[PDB]
Amino acid sequence: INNLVKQAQKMQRDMERVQEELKEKTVEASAGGGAVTVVATGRKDIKEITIKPEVVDPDDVEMLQDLILAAVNEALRKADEMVTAEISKIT
Amino acid sequence: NINNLVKQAQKMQRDMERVQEELKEKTVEASAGGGAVTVVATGRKDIKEITIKPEVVDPDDVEMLQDLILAAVNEALRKADEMVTAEISKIT
């Protein structure tokens, strides 16, 4: 029972630390062969969005809509994945 | 005493199952640039739709668009978190 207590306590310390660490850790996704790039943190805050002017065309807003949507969703997916990895490492 | 605990725990169980299911399809919406960029996200923080008005689409000013998309997405994601909290409060 002693070693279980210490193990659970360690898991609790590790979890509080990884929570902090994940706030600033980031992932990156892009779409359109690098025309759109999205950086998200481990808390799923979008930190940055970079768009190349070649896909910015007021007569083809659907292109940019599609591209933003794909890169944002893939960035959010990667952030979920990073969180799971970090939790797996400490459990 | 025991019967009521069984009843309350079963209710909690089905309500939580139901709410999880409904949040997958329920959406929230957020806007920036005076309605120029509108983002729809689900209760699972999937982005469902982004609508961009051509008035903010200028290849000589990609920063305008970056800025409005970042704001709109971040606010949509925050509204998604708030809806999940709200739906859980209703079952607790």
Side-chain angles (χ1 to χ4, degrees), chain A residues 3-5 7-18 20-22 25-42 44-46 48-91, chain B residues 1 4-6 9-10 12-19 22-23 26-43 45-47 50-81 83-92:
Chain A
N3 298 333
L4 175 61
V5 168
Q7 275 162 62
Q9 287 179 323
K10 165 80 180 152
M11 208 159 318
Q12 179 163 61
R13 288 193 297 277
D14 284 347
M15 187 61 63
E16 296 175 35
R17 173 173 55 75
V18 170
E20 291 177 325
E21 294 178 357
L22 282 166
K25 275 175 143 92
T26 64
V27 294
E28 193 181 274
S30 66
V36 173
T37 305
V38 178
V39 185
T41 68
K44 305 171 106 150
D45 189 45
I46 307 300
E48 314 173 36
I49 295 177
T50 311
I51 302 169
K52 294 187 178 170
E54 65 201 58
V55 302
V56 183
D57 185 339
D59 296 303
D60 191 6
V61 157
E62 286 72 26
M63 162 172 60
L64 195 27
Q65 285 180 183
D66 285 352
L67 284 174
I68 300 310
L69 197 64
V72 171
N73 282 315
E74 178 60 9
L76 293 173
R77 198 157 344 136
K78 286 173 148 158
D80 283 334
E81 177 181 75
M82 164 170 82
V83 175
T84 305
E86 295 300 316
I87 293 164
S88 283
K89 286 170 204 179
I90 67 183
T91 67
Chain B
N1 274 109
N4 300 307
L5 185 74
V6 170
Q10 291 174 317
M12 181 62 65
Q13 187 179 54
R14 60 179 183 269
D15 283 350
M16 192 60 204
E17 184 188 339
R18 183 187 38 75
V19 169
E22 290 168 352
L23 286 166
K26 279 208 215 294
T27 62
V28 292
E29 191 182 281
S31 221
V37 171
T38 301
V39 178
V40 178
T42 71
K45 293 155 109 178
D46 191 355
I47 309 296
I50 300 165
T51 305
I52 299 160
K53 297 184 185 184
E55 44 263 49
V56 294
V57 184
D58 187 347
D60 300 330
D61 193 356
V62 302
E63 289 66 31
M64 168 168 46
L65 206 86
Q66 294 174 173
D67 284 352
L68 300 177
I69 289 152
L70 178 156
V73 176
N74 280 329
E75 178 67 358
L77 290 173
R78 287 193 301 260
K79 291 199 182 179
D81 284 335
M83 167 176 76
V84 172
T85 295
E87 295 304 315
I88 287 167
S89 299
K90 288 170 182 172
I91 67 156
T92 58

